[PDB]
Amino acid sequence: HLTPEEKSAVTALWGKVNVDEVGGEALGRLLVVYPWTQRFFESFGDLSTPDAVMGNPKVKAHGKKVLGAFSDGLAHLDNLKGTFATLSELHCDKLHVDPENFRLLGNVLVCVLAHHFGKEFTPPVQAAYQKVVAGVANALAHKYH
């Protein structure tokens, strides 16, 4: 539930997001900080070192796809449940990803946005983005509900 000011701020900040690096950075940071999530990406090659994780082309491409999904969810903020129905099916009935990792990834993305934008990532902007990522995780975890 975003106010018009929150929606405008989120859209404005997302307009400046590099769509080729931010998603891969967030996915790599998730893999480094929560190493049990590496279980789901054993076909991605070497993930033993954080340098190896952040240097993985497979991780970069998958992060690009995840960032594209996040952008699609941001484009439809009032239909998150219907936007992420297929992805929820894929993540739950095929991958068995515990939905706590969805919120972990959302928080890692918030940290990445803070690290990229610095002072521009004000506490109100962060609160709006926390609302956004919580909604995205809830929509993605619908199959278990």
């Binding site: 940071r29 480094v32 954080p50 940290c111 690290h115 990229h116 610095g118 506490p123 109100p124 962060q126």
Partner: protein, 139 residues
């Protein structure tokens, strides 16, 4: 944790330097804004933007974190009174500790872009997690 984790955390908190109180106040403000359920714990507080009470509480939290960094090998003994306070008197739900840890990490990322490498991020996350377990070990 690890010796490399200790080195990373010490370097990051040294780079925090004399901005620790301001950073802690900013983290508390972020927690209040992003997670309004945290505000219930501080009812007699003025939690508006720029509040001196929030400034002082952030200074206190930052000084406790600096002491924890200085005693990373003796955190349970360094944080005994704080754990007693938070678990027995305040009875803080342990999820709010995760919330405050995330807000502290966000403040650190927003203020130290060069220092917030993935390895430093992992070390700081581990350190704040250990602080939270020490503070929640007295229920």
């Amino acid at each position: 944790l690890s010796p490399a984790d200790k080195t990373n955390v010490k370097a990051a908190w040294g780079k925090v330097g004399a901005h620790a109180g301001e950073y802690g106040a900013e983290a508390l403000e972020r927690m209040f804004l992003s997670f309004p359920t945290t505000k219930t714990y501080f009812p007699h507080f003025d939690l508006s933007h720029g509040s001196a009470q929030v400034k002082g509480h952030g200074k206190k939290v930052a000084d406790a974190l600096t002491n924890a960094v200085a005693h990373v090998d003796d955190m349970p003994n360094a944080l005994s009174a704080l754990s007693d306070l938070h678990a027995h008197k305040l009875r803080v739900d342990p999820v709010n500790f995760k919330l405050l840890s995330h807000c502290l990490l966000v403040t650190l990322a927003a203020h130290l872009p060069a220092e917030f490498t993935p390895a430093v991020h992992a070390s700081l996350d581990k350190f704040l997690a250990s602080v939270s377990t020490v503070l929640t070990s007295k229920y």
